[PDB]
Coordinates of C-alpha atoms in Angstrom, one line a residue:
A1 CA 19.0 -50.2 80.0
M2 CA 18.0 -52.9 80.0
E3 CA 14.4 -52.5 81.0
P4 CA 10.7 -53.2 80.3
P5 CA 9.1 -50.0 79.2
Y6 CA 7.9 -47.4 81.8
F7 CA 6.0 -44.1 82.1
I8 CA 7.8 -40.8 82.5
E9 CA 4.4 -39.2 82.1
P10 CA 1.3 -41.4 82.4
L11 CA -2.2 -41.0 80.8
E12 CA -4.1 -38.4 82.7
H13 CA -7.8 -37.4 83.1
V14 CA -9.0 -35.2 80.2
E15 CA -12.0 -33.0 79.6
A16 CA -12.8 -32.6 75.9
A17 CA -15.1 -30.2 74.2
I18 CA -17.7 -31.9 72.0
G19 CA -17.2 -31.7 68.2
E20 CA -13.6 -30.8 68.5
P21 CA -10.5 -33.0 68.3
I22 CA -8.7 -33.9 71.5
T23 CA -5.2 -35.3 72.0
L24 CA -4.3 -37.8 74.7
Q25 CA -0.7 -38.7 75.6
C26 CA 2.0 -40.1 77.8
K27 CA 5.8 -40.4 77.8
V28 CA 7.5 -43.7 77.8
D29 CA 11.2 -44.6 78.2
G30 CA 12.9 -48.0 78.1
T31 CA 14.7 -50.6 76.0
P32 CA 14.5 -49.9 72.2
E33 CA 11.7 -51.3 70.1
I34 CA 8.8 -50.2 72.4
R35 CA 5.3 -50.7 70.9
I36 CA 2.2 -49.0 72.2
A37 CA -1.4 -50.1 71.9
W38 CA -4.4 -48.0 72.9
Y39 CA -7.6 -49.3 74.3
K40 CA -11.0 -48.7 75.8
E41 CA -10.0 -51.3 78.3
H42 CA -12.7 -53.7 77.0
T43 CA -11.2 -53.1 73.6
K44 CA -8.0 -52.4 71.6
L45 CA -8.1 -49.3 69.5
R46 CA -7.2 -49.9 65.8
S47 CA -6.2 -46.9 63.7
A48 CA -8.7 -45.4 61.4
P49 CA -10.4 -42.2 60.1
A50 CA -11.3 -41.2 63.7
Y51 CA -8.1 -42.2 65.4
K52 CA -4.6 -40.9 64.7
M53 CA -2.0 -42.6 66.9
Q54 CA 1.7 -41.7 66.9
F55 CA 5.0 -42.3 68.7
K56 CA 7.7 -39.8 68.0
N57 CA 10.3 -39.1 70.7
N58 CA 9.2 -41.0 73.8
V59 CA 5.7 -39.5 73.6
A60 CA 2.8 -41.7 72.6
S61 CA -0.3 -39.8 71.5
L62 CA -3.9 -40.7 70.5
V63 CA -5.6 -38.1 68.4
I64 CA -9.4 -38.1 68.4
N65 CA -10.2 -36.2 65.3
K66 CA -13.5 -35.1 66.6
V67 CA -15.0 -35.9 70.0
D68 CA -18.4 -37.4 70.4
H69 CA -20.4 -39.1 73.2
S70 CA -18.9 -42.5 72.2
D71 CA -15.4 -41.3 73.0
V72 CA -16.2 -40.6 76.7
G73 CA -14.9 -43.4 79.0
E74 CA -11.7 -45.2 80.0
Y75 CA -8.6 -45.2 77.8
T76 CA -5.4 -47.3 78.2
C77 CA -2.0 -46.9 76.7
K78 CA 0.2 -50.1 76.8
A79 CA 3.9 -49.9 75.9
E80 CA 5.7 -53.1 75.1
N81 CA 9.2 -54.3 74.6
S82 CA 10.8 -57.8 74.4
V83 CA 11.4 -57.5 78.1
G84 CA 8.0 -56.5 79.4
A85 CA 5.0 -54.2 79.3
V86 CA 3.4 -51.3 81.2
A87 CA 0.0 -49.8 80.8
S88 CA -1.6 -46.6 82.0
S89 CA -5.3 -45.7 82.0
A90 CA -7.1 -42.4 82.4
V91 CA -10.6 -41.1 81.6
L92 CA -11.9 -38.8 78.8
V93 CA -14.9 -36.8 79.9
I94 CA -17.1 -34.2 78.1
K95 CA -16.8 -30.5 78.9
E96 CA -20.4 -30.0 80.0
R97 CA -20.4 -26.2 79.7
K98 CA -23.2 -23.7 80.0
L99 CA -22.9 -20.2 78.5
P100 CA -24.9 -17.0 78.4
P101 CA -25.9 -15.4 75.1
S102 CA -23.3 -13.5 73.0
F103 CA -23.3 -11.9 69.5
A104 CA -20.5 -13.1 67.3
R105 CA -20.1 -9.7 65.5
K106 CA -22.1 -6.5 65.8
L107 CA -25.5 -6.3 64.2
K108 CA -24.3 -4.7 60.9
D109 CA -26.0 -1.6 59.6
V110 CA -28.1 -1.9 56.4
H111 CA -28.3 0.7 53.6
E112 CA -30.9 -0.5 51.1
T113 CA -33.5 1.0 48.9
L114 CA -37.1 2.2 49.4
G115 CA -39.9 -0.1 48.3
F116 CA -37.6 -3.1 48.4
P117 CA -36.9 -6.0 50.8
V118 CA -34.3 -5.7 53.5
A119 CA -32.9 -8.1 56.1
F120 CA -31.0 -7.8 59.3
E121 CA -29.1 -10.8 60.6
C122 CA -26.6 -11.9 63.2
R123 CA -25.1 -15.0 64.9
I124 CA -25.9 -15.5 68.6
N125 CA -24.1 -18.2 70.7
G126 CA -25.3 -19.5 74.0
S127 CA -27.2 -22.3 75.7
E128 CA -30.6 -23.1 74.5
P129 CA -33.3 -22.1 75.0
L130 CA -32.3 -18.8 73.4
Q131 CA -34.9 -16.1 73.0
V132 CA -34.6 -13.3 70.5
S133 CA -36.5 -10.0 70.4
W134 CA -36.1 -7.2 67.8
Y135 CA -37.0 -3.6 68.7
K136 CA -37.2 -0.5 66.5
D137 CA -36.8 2.4 68.9
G138 CA -38.3 1.2 72.1
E139 CA -41.2 -0.7 70.5
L140 CA -41.1 -4.5 70.2
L141 CA -41.4 -5.8 66.7
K142 CA -43.9 -8.6 65.8
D143 CA -44.2 -10.6 62.6
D144 CA -46.9 -9.3 60.4
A145 CA -47.5 -9.5 56.6
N146 CA -44.5 -7.3 56.0
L147 CA -42.1 -8.1 58.9
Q148 CA -40.5 -11.5 59.1
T149 CA -38.1 -13.0 61.7
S150 CA -36.4 -16.3 62.1
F151 CA -33.9 -17.8 64.5
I152 CA -32.3 -21.3 63.9
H153 CA -28.9 -22.9 64.1
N154 CA -27.9 -19.9 66.1
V155 CA -28.7 -17.4 63.3
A156 CA -31.3 -14.7 63.9
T157 CA -32.8 -12.6 61.0
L158 CA -35.3 -9.8 60.5
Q159 CA -36.7 -9.3 57.0
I160 CA -38.9 -6.5 55.7
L161 CA -40.5 -7.3 52.3
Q162 CA -41.4 -3.8 51.1
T163 CA -39.5 -1.1 52.9
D164 CA -41.1 2.1 53.7
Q165 CA -39.9 5.5 54.9
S166 CA -41.3 4.4 58.3
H167 CA -38.7 1.6 58.5
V168 CA -35.8 4.0 58.6
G169 CA -34.2 4.1 62.0
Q170 CA -32.4 2.0 64.7
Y171 CA -33.1 -1.6 65.3
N172 CA -32.2 -3.5 68.4
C173 CA -31.6 -7.2 68.6
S174 CA -31.4 -8.7 72.1
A175 CA -31.0 -12.3 73.0
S176 CA -31.5 -14.0 76.3
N177 CA -31.1 -17.4 78.0
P178 CA -31.5 -18.2 81.7
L179 CA -27.8 -17.5 82.1
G180 CA -27.7 -13.9 81.0
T181 CA -28.2 -11.4 78.2
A182 CA -26.7 -10.0 75.0
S183 CA -27.6 -7.2 72.5
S184 CA -26.6 -5.4 69.4
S185 CA -28.2 -2.6 67.4
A186 CA -27.8 -1.2 64.0
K187 CA -29.5 1.2 61.7
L188 CA -31.7 1.1 58.6
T189 CA -31.4 3.7 55.9
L190 CA -33.2 3.8 52.5
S191 CA -32.5 5.5 49.2
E192 CA -34.7 6.3 46.2
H193 CA -35.0 3.9 43.3
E194 CA -32.8 5.2 40.5
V195 CA -32.1 3.2 37.4
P196 CA -28.8 4.4 35.9
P197 CA -29.2 5.2 32.1
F198 CA -28.2 2.8 29.4
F199 CA -28.9 2.9 25.7
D200 CA -31.2 0.0 24.9
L201 CA -30.8 0.8 21.2
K202 CA -27.5 1.8 19.7
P203 CA -27.2 4.0 16.6
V204 CA -25.8 2.7 13.3
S205 CA -22.6 3.9 11.6
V206 CA -23.4 4.7 8.1
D207 CA -21.5 5.5 4.9
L208 CA -23.3 8.5 3.4
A209 CA -22.6 10.5 0.2
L210 CA -21.9 14.2 -0.1
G211 CA -25.0 16.4 0.1
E212 CA -27.8 14.0 1.1
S213 CA -28.7 13.8 4.7
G214 CA -28.8 10.9 7.1
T215 CA -29.6 10.2 10.8
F216 CA -28.1 8.5 13.9
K217 CA -30.8 7.0 16.0
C218 CA -30.5 5.7 19.5
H219 CA -32.8 4.9 22.5
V220 CA -32.1 5.2 26.2
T221 CA -33.8 3.8 29.3
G222 CA -33.5 4.8 32.9
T223 CA -35.2 6.9 35.6
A224 CA -36.4 10.1 34.0
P225 CA -35.2 12.7 33.5
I226 CA -32.3 11.7 31.3
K227 CA -30.2 14.6 30.0
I228 CA -29.0 13.8 26.5
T229 CA -26.3 15.6 24.6
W230 CA -24.2 14.9 21.5
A231 CA -20.6 15.3 20.6
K232 CA -19.0 14.8 17.1
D233 CA -15.2 14.4 17.2
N234 CA -15.1 15.1 21.0
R235 CA -16.7 18.6 20.8
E236 CA -20.2 19.2 22.1
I237 CA -22.5 19.5 19.1
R238 CA -24.7 22.6 19.3
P239 CA -27.8 23.6 17.4
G240 CA -27.9 26.0 14.4
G241 CA -25.7 24.4 11.7
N242 CA -25.3 21.3 9.7
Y243 CA -26.3 19.1 12.7
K244 CA -29.8 18.8 14.1
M245 CA -30.6 16.9 17.3
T246 CA -34.0 15.7 18.3
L247 CA -35.3 13.6 21.2
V248 CA -38.8 12.3 22.0
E249 CA -39.5 9.7 24.7
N250 CA -35.9 8.8 25.2
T251 CA -35.2 8.4 21.5
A252 CA -32.3 10.7 20.5
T253 CA -31.6 11.4 16.8
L254 CA -28.8 13.4 15.3
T255 CA -29.3 14.2 11.6
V256 CA -26.5 15.6 9.4
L257 CA -28.3 17.8 6.8
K258 CA -25.9 18.6 4.0
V259 CA -23.1 16.0 4.2
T260 CA -19.9 18.0 3.5
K261 CA -16.3 16.6 3.7
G262 CA -16.1 17.8 7.3
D263 CA -19.0 15.8 8.6
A264 CA -17.1 12.5 8.6
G265 CA -16.1 11.1 12.0
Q266 CA -17.3 9.8 15.4
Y267 CA -20.7 10.7 16.7
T268 CA -21.3 10.0 20.3
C269 CA -24.5 10.3 22.4
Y270 CA -24.4 11.1 26.1
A271 CA -27.1 10.2 28.6
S272 CA -27.3 11.1 32.2
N273 CA -29.6 10.9 35.2
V274 CA -29.2 11.2 39.0
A275 CA -27.7 7.7 39.3
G276 CA -25.4 7.3 36.3
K277 CA -24.3 7.9 32.7
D278 CA -23.7 6.1 29.4
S279 CA -22.8 6.8 25.8
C280 CA -22.8 5.1 22.4
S281 CA -20.9 6.0 19.2
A282 CA -21.6 5.8 15.5
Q283 CA -19.5 6.9 12.5
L284 CA -20.3 9.0 9.4
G285 CA -18.2 8.0 6.4
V286 CA -18.4 10.5 3.6
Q287 CA -17.5 9.2 0.1
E288 CA -15.3 11.5 -1.9
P289 CA -15.1 10.8 -5.7
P290 CA -11.6 10.9 -7.1
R291 CA -10.1 14.3 -7.7
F292 CA -7.1 15.3 -9.8
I293 CA -4.3 16.6 -7.6
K294 CA -1.6 16.6 -10.2
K295 CA -3.1 16.3 -13.7
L296 CA -1.4 15.4 -16.9
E297 CA 0.2 18.0 -19.2
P298 CA -2.1 18.9 -22.1
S299 CA 0.1 17.8 -25.0
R300 CA 3.6 16.4 -25.6
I301 CA 6.0 15.5 -28.4
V302 CA 8.5 12.6 -28.7
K303 CA 10.8 11.0 -31.3
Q304 CA 10.0 7.6 -32.8
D305 CA 11.9 4.7 -31.2
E306 CA 12.1 6.2 -27.7
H307 CA 10.0 6.5 -24.5
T308 CA 8.1 8.8 -22.2
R309 CA 6.6 8.7 -18.7
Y310 CA 3.1 10.0 -18.1
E311 CA 2.2 10.3 -14.4
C312 CA -0.9 11.2 -12.6
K313 CA -1.9 12.1 -9.0
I314 CA -5.2 10.7 -7.8
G315 CA -7.0 10.9 -4.5
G316 CA -10.4 10.4 -2.8
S317 CA -12.0 7.3 -1.3
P318 CA -10.2 4.0 -0.6
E319 CA -10.1 1.2 -3.2
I320 CA -9.3 3.3 -6.3
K321 CA -8.7 2.0 -9.9
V322 CA -6.8 3.3 -12.9
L323 CA -7.6 2.5 -16.4
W324 CA -5.8 4.1 -19.3
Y325 CA -7.7 4.7 -22.6
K326 CA -5.7 5.0 -25.9
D327 CA -8.4 6.7 -28.1
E328 CA -11.1 5.3 -25.8
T329 CA -9.7 1.8 -26.0
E330 CA -8.4 0.1 -22.8
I331 CA -4.6 0.0 -22.5
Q332 CA -3.0 -3.4 -21.7
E333 CA 0.1 -3.9 -19.6
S334 CA 3.0 -4.6 -21.9
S335 CA 6.6 -3.5 -22.5
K336 CA 4.8 -0.9 -24.7
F337 CA 2.3 0.5 -22.2
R338 CA 3.6 0.0 -18.6
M339 CA 1.5 1.0 -15.6
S340 CA 1.6 1.0 -11.8
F341 CA -0.7 2.5 -9.2
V342 CA 1.0 3.1 -5.8
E343 CA -0.3 5.6 -3.3
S344 CA -2.0 8.1 -5.7
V345 CA 0.6 7.7 -8.4
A346 CA -0.8 6.6 -11.8
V347 CA 2.2 6.0 -14.0
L348 CA 2.1 5.1 -17.7
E349 CA 5.6 4.3 -19.0
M350 CA 5.7 3.9 -22.8
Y351 CA 8.8 2.2 -24.3
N352 CA 9.7 1.8 -28.0
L353 CA 7.4 4.7 -29.1
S354 CA 6.5 5.3 -32.8
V355 CA 4.0 6.8 -35.2
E356 CA 1.6 4.0 -34.1
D357 CA 1.4 5.5 -30.5
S358 CA -0.1 8.9 -31.4
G359 CA -3.5 10.4 -31.0
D360 CA -5.2 10.9 -27.6
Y361 CA -4.7 9.4 -24.1
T362 CA -7.1 9.4 -21.1
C363 CA -6.5 8.4 -17.5
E364 CA -9.6 7.0 -15.9
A365 CA -9.7 6.4 -12.1
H366 CA -13.0 5.4 -10.4
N367 CA -14.2 4.7 -6.9
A368 CA -17.2 4.0 -4.6
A369 CA -19.3 6.7 -6.2
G370 CA -17.2 8.8 -8.5
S371 CA -14.9 8.7 -11.5
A372 CA -13.2 11.7 -13.2
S373 CA -10.5 11.6 -15.9
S374 CA -7.5 13.5 -17.2
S375 CA -6.8 13.4 -20.9
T376 CA -3.6 14.2 -22.8
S377 CA -2.5 14.4 -26.5
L378 CA 0.6 12.4 -27.6
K379 CA 2.4 12.9 -30.9
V380 CA 5.3 10.7 -31.8
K381 CA 7.1 12.0 -34.9
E382 CA 9.7 10.9 -37.4
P383 CA 13.0 12.7 -37.8
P384 CA 14.0 14.2 -41.2
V385 CA 16.0 11.8 -43.4
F386 CA 17.5 12.6 -46.8
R387 CA 16.8 9.3 -48.6
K388 CA 18.9 9.7 -51.8
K389 CA 22.0 11.8 -52.1
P390 CA 21.4 13.7 -55.4
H391 CA 24.2 12.6 -57.9
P392 CA 26.5 15.6 -58.7
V393 CA 25.4 17.7 -61.6
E394 CA 28.0 18.6 -64.3
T395 CA 26.6 21.3 -66.6
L396 CA 27.6 24.0 -69.1
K397 CA 27.2 27.7 -68.8
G398 CA 23.9 29.6 -69.5
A399 CA 22.1 26.4 -68.6
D400 CA 19.6 26.0 -65.7
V401 CA 20.3 23.2 -63.4
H402 CA 17.6 21.5 -61.3
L403 CA 19.0 20.1 -58.1
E404 CA 16.7 18.0 -55.8
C405 CA 16.8 15.9 -52.6
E406 CA 14.6 13.0 -51.5
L407 CA 12.9 13.5 -48.1
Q408 CA 11.2 11.3 -45.6
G409 CA 10.0 11.6 -42.0
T410 CA 7.3 13.7 -40.3
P411 CA 6.2 16.9 -42.2
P412 CA 6.0 19.8 -42.3
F413 CA 9.7 20.4 -42.6
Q414 CA 12.1 23.3 -42.3
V415 CA 14.2 23.3 -45.5
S416 CA 17.1 25.6 -46.1
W417 CA 19.7 25.7 -48.9
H418 CA 23.1 27.3 -48.3
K419 CA 26.1 27.8 -50.6
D420 CA 29.4 28.8 -49.0
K421 CA 27.8 29.8 -45.8
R422 CA 25.4 32.1 -47.6
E423 CA 21.7 31.4 -47.3
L424 CA 20.1 31.3 -50.8
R425 CA 16.6 32.8 -51.1
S426 CA 14.2 32.2 -54.1
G427 CA 15.2 35.3 -56.1
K428 CA 16.2 35.7 -59.7
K429 CA 19.0 33.1 -59.6
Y430 CA 17.5 30.6 -57.2
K431 CA 14.2 28.9 -57.1
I432 CA 13.8 26.9 -54.0
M433 CA 10.7 24.7 -53.5
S434 CA 9.5 22.7 -50.5
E435 CA 6.6 20.2 -50.6
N436 CA 5.3 17.2 -48.6
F437 CA 8.3 15.0 -49.1
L438 CA 10.1 17.0 -51.8
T439 CA 12.9 19.6 -51.7
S440 CA 14.8 21.2 -54.5
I441 CA 16.3 24.4 -56.0
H442 CA 16.7 25.8 -59.5
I443 CA 19.9 27.6 -60.3
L444 CA 19.2 29.6 -63.5
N445 CA 21.6 30.6 -66.2
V446 CA 24.7 29.1 -64.6
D447 CA 27.9 31.2 -64.2
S448 CA 31.3 30.5 -62.5
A449 CA 30.0 31.8 -59.2
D450 CA 27.6 28.9 -59.2
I451 CA 30.3 26.4 -59.6
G452 CA 30.6 24.9 -56.2
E453 CA 29.0 22.8 -53.5
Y454 CA 25.4 23.2 -52.3
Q455 CA 24.3 22.3 -48.8
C456 CA 20.7 21.4 -47.7
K457 CA 19.4 21.4 -44.1
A458 CA 16.0 19.9 -43.4
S459 CA 14.5 19.6 -39.9
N460 CA 11.3 19.3 -38.0
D461 CA 10.2 19.3 -34.3
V462 CA 12.4 16.3 -33.5
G463 CA 15.5 15.9 -35.7
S464 CA 17.6 17.3 -38.5
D465 CA 19.6 16.4 -41.7
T466 CA 22.2 17.7 -44.2
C467 CA 21.9 16.9 -47.9
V468 CA 24.7 17.7 -50.3
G469 CA 24.8 18.1 -54.1
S470 CA 27.5 19.7 -56.2
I471 CA 27.7 21.6 -59.5
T472 CA 30.8 20.8 -61.6
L473 CA 31.5 22.6 -64.9
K474 CA 31.6 20.5 -68.0
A475 CA 35.0 20.9 -69.6
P476 CA 35.3 21.6 -73.4
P477 CA 37.6 19.5 -75.6
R478 CA 41.2 20.8 -75.8
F479 CA 44.4 19.6 -77.5
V480 CA 47.1 18.7 -75.0
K481 CA 49.3 18.0 -78.0
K482 CA 48.1 19.4 -81.3
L483 CA 48.9 17.3 -84.4
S484 CA 52.4 17.6 -85.7
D485 CA 53.7 17.2 -89.3
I486 CA 54.9 13.8 -90.6
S487 CA 56.9 12.7 -93.7
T488 CA 57.6 9.1 -94.5
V489 CA 59.0 6.9 -97.3
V490 CA 56.3 5.6 -99.6
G491 CA 55.1 2.2 -98.3
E492 CA 56.0 3.1 -94.7
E493 CA 53.7 3.5 -91.7
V494 CA 52.4 6.8 -90.4
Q495 CA 50.5 7.8 -87.2
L496 CA 49.0 11.2 -86.9
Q497 CA 48.3 11.6 -83.1
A498 CA 46.9 14.1 -80.6
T499 CA 46.2 13.9 -76.9
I500 CA 42.7 15.0 -76.0
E501 CA 41.2 16.4 -72.8
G502 CA 37.7 17.4 -71.5
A503 CA 34.2 16.0 -70.8
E504 CA 34.3 12.3 -71.5
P505 CA 31.4 12.2 -74.0
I506 CA 33.8 13.1 -76.8
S507 CA 33.7 12.7 -80.6
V508 CA 36.6 13.0 -83.0
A509 CA 36.3 13.9 -86.7
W510 CA 38.9 13.4 -89.4
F511 CA 39.1 15.6 -92.5
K512 CA 41.3 16.1 -95.5
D513 CA 40.9 19.2 -97.7
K514 CA 37.3 19.5 -96.5
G515 CA 36.6 15.9 -97.5
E516 CA 35.1 13.8 -94.8
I517 CA 37.6 11.0 -94.2
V518 CA 36.5 7.3 -93.9
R519 CA 38.6 4.4 -92.6
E520 CA 39.1 1.7 -95.4
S521 CA 41.7 -0.8 -94.2
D522 CA 44.1 -0.4 -97.2
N523 CA 46.0 1.5 -94.5
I524 CA 43.5 3.8 -92.8
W525 CA 42.4 3.1 -89.2
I526 CA 40.7 6.0 -87.3
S527 CA 40.5 5.8 -83.6
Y528 CA 40.2 7.3 -80.1
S529 CA 41.1 5.5 -76.8
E530 CA 42.3 6.8 -73.4
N531 CA 42.4 10.4 -74.5
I532 CA 44.4 10.0 -77.8
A533 CA 43.3 10.0 -81.4
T534 CA 45.2 8.3 -84.2
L535 CA 44.7 8.5 -88.0
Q536 CA 46.9 5.5 -88.7
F537 CA 48.3 4.4 -92.1
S538 CA 49.5 0.8 -92.2
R539 CA 50.9 1.5 -95.6
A540 CA 51.5 5.1 -96.8
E541 CA 51.6 6.2 -100.5
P542 CA 51.0 9.1 -102.8
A543 CA 47.7 11.1 -102.3
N544 CA 48.0 10.4 -98.6
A545 CA 49.8 13.8 -98.6
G546 CA 48.2 17.0 -97.5
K547 CA 46.2 18.7 -94.7
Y548 CA 44.7 16.5 -92.0
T549 CA 42.4 18.3 -89.6
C550 CA 41.4 16.6 -86.4
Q551 CA 38.2 17.9 -84.8
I552 CA 37.5 16.9 -81.2
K553 CA 33.9 17.8 -80.2
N554 CA 31.9 17.4 -77.0
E555 CA 28.9 19.5 -75.7
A556 CA 30.8 22.4 -74.1
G557 CA 32.5 23.3 -77.4
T558 CA 34.7 22.1 -80.4
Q559 CA 38.3 22.6 -81.3
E560 CA 40.6 21.5 -84.2
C561 CA 44.2 21.5 -85.4
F562 CA 45.8 20.3 -88.6
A563 CA 49.1 18.7 -89.6
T564 CA 50.5 18.1 -93.1
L565 CA 51.6 14.6 -94.1
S566 CA 54.2 14.9 -96.9
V567 CA 54.9 11.6 -98.7
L568 CA 58.5 11.8 -100.1
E569 CA 59.0 10.0 -103.4

């Protein structure tokens, strides 16, 4: 400060190896903003692919990326600042070296195979002319039809086209230039040609059916002899049973004779020779028709207007199908005939049952090569129902009374008649009868014991009913108030009256001294209303005096009473 640049370290003479990058340099101090230019005196160097020039710290450096004869000569570095300039020159010169032979790495041993080519090889550095000689044992090797050697760009080789037991042994490779000598040896060994086994033809997985036989068929190639063995489901297959194995000229064949259920699975063939092994695998798929695990129950019975759930258990081969057959006719999927197949469960859920849903039912599942069925027998019945309630019977004694009930439902029925908790059997007194839709009993020659209520129970396999019919006794006619006497003044009104009781079909009769009385309206008006009879006289008079007999008269009997009208004059 403040100066023209200057050299701490100037350019110096350099010896560079050809083909490799050199780096020239010098240190320069001085006033800031120093700029260096490089030269071959008679020329300024410009930067480029070949030249890499820098100036970090106070060191300026030219980097020749690869040295060649053109780079030899005189170089100049010229530092400049606004005050002045310095320049230092030195010379780049080639390292003109001369070296004896030398192997880069030992002659590697070779371990190839009889009857096949082999080649030794190594790199050898050193000044040309380099000579190379190969020796097996102590004999020098020469190129003939089978032995070949090269040596170029510093790489020596030794090739044997078809190798031979004779070639086994140690090989020496010695180089030499007029500067000295190098050498490496290595050994040749040869093995026999073995082709590891492989199956050129793989066997096919088949889906066979129970019984019939089939075959797995594969082919192997490789150096004989190839030992073949089989193994179904990872267990060596041995001769004698359902499996038979043959093999002729490398073609193995495993035949399953009578395909049972237990022949399904993985069949693997195993080949083996001195130099390796292989194996291939097929698959026997045995098809099992559907079989009934949990069948339907033979028959069943259900009430009308109900439901029931038939359910089946089916198994076998994959992709199964259930089809229900009501009397051989396919069963649709409705609210009437429900269905669902899920993991072996064939359900038929029937809602709103009735007499229409009777007869037979078959469950039909089928598959790949099978189809068995389970059939059942339904029977939807009608409960007993006493239609009419037999109007009560009111009868007289000694009479037979026929009592009957109206019946409807599903026959046959279980009819019973009871009176006062006693069961009545068709004896002398009772005559019970039970037909298709008809029930009744005959009570003969009715007495007081029979007066009462009769109870009828009908029932079948599903339901039950109680019918009721009564036997009332028909009451005779009786006088609640027998006629009484009367006596009026002539011209005055009279009313002979009695109050009557009994069975309502009643008939009154008016008499007078045995003479059948009429009802002329000069005064006479004969009647009967609301249980009272009146022989009226709107205007009494002589002759209207004497016996008057009233005779009430229904079906259970007759009774009478008289009364004397006395007309006082």
